[PDB]
Chain length 191, copies 2
């Protein structure tokens, strides 16, 4: 009898959630793309203000990348709400392209009342220069980036997936993939 | 450089650098000894194999140590540059033994090139690399050039060029970053 984030969204299939990662090597193709976001105030102790899921089958074109959809939605949301300081969390399934990173950064500059934390499930094209730069572009703008570990997948399952009481069911390579991807992110950001 | 070379298919299958790999129970170690002289030709060169299963004494790192001891008697006290090309990174028990060795004998500098990190997600095996690095061993992930040198020197490729498998540089990037992360601070 308390306000849950699950009630504030249209939750995704378990299948839409895990099909990209479950028993699939880091260097794979994709079935879906998603971005689960959460909005809070300065105080992390507070209750979650609002949340939304941007999902779709893979390879939308630039304009409909979940990151851009988020920016359109959150630009209006900021206007239809009290002005204070907000902290935004993303759980996003794929790597930001350069075009999304630039639009997000410019946003972060015009609206310093907002800080952004990004959890990425899997890096892609991390060997391509533009994708590496996109990560640095976001860090430069003050966005915080981390790879999703068990807790984050678990949390994202609890808040955003149609789980039906059922618990998060981790795949075997999840911590292995995490270590590899977290080290690679770290590397791309420093160098 | 007369080694008893390994078979092409043994190479391609054991030095494949997918980070997460099953069905490779064998560690392969190709080694080269030189004088600290950067010009000095290969003194000797050997190939050791060992199942990664129980006896850590039958790991190719251990076998190398004994061989290198007898070898270091048959010949003269001088400065040695050892290089390794190994298919899995050292288990924690071999790390200790190799560390100890390098400590006692300071006129030998070891450089370990690694195709894959063994249990990189496990804290105990992460410590192994830290131990080796403390003892002065240079740790590096094998990239194209190292796979190619290992091919030329240790494989029976009948003149044919080293040919890269799918995703060699992509796997490299993952592994090298991971190694760097594990040796930070
Ligand atoms: Zn994009
Ligand atoms: Zn061992």
């Amino acid at each position: 009898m308390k306000p849950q984030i699950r009630n504030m969204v249209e939750p995704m299939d378990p299948r839409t959630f895990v099909s990209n990662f479950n028993n699939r090597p880091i260097l794979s193709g994709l079935d879906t793309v998603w971005l689960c976001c959460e909005v809070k105030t300065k105080d992390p102790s507070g209750p979650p203000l609002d949340a939304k899921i941007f999902q779709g089958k893979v390879y939308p074109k630039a304009k409909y990348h979940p990151e851009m959809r988020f920016l359109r939605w959150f630009h209006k949301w900021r206007q239809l709400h009290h002005d204070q300081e907000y902290k935004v969390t993303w759980y996003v399934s794929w790597s930001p392209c350069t075009r999304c990173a630039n639009s997000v950064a410019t946003f972060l500059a015009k609206d310093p009342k907002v800080t952004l934390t990004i959890f990425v499930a899997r890096l892609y094209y991390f060997w391509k220069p533009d994708y590496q730069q996109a990560l640095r572009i976001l860090a430069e703008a003050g966005a915080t980036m981390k790879i999703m570990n068990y807790n984050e997948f678990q949390d994202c399952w609890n808040k955003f997936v149609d789980g039906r009481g059922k618990p998060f069911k981790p795949w075997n390579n999840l911590p292995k993939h995490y270590t590899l991807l977290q080290a690679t992110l770290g590397e791309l950001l420093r160098h």
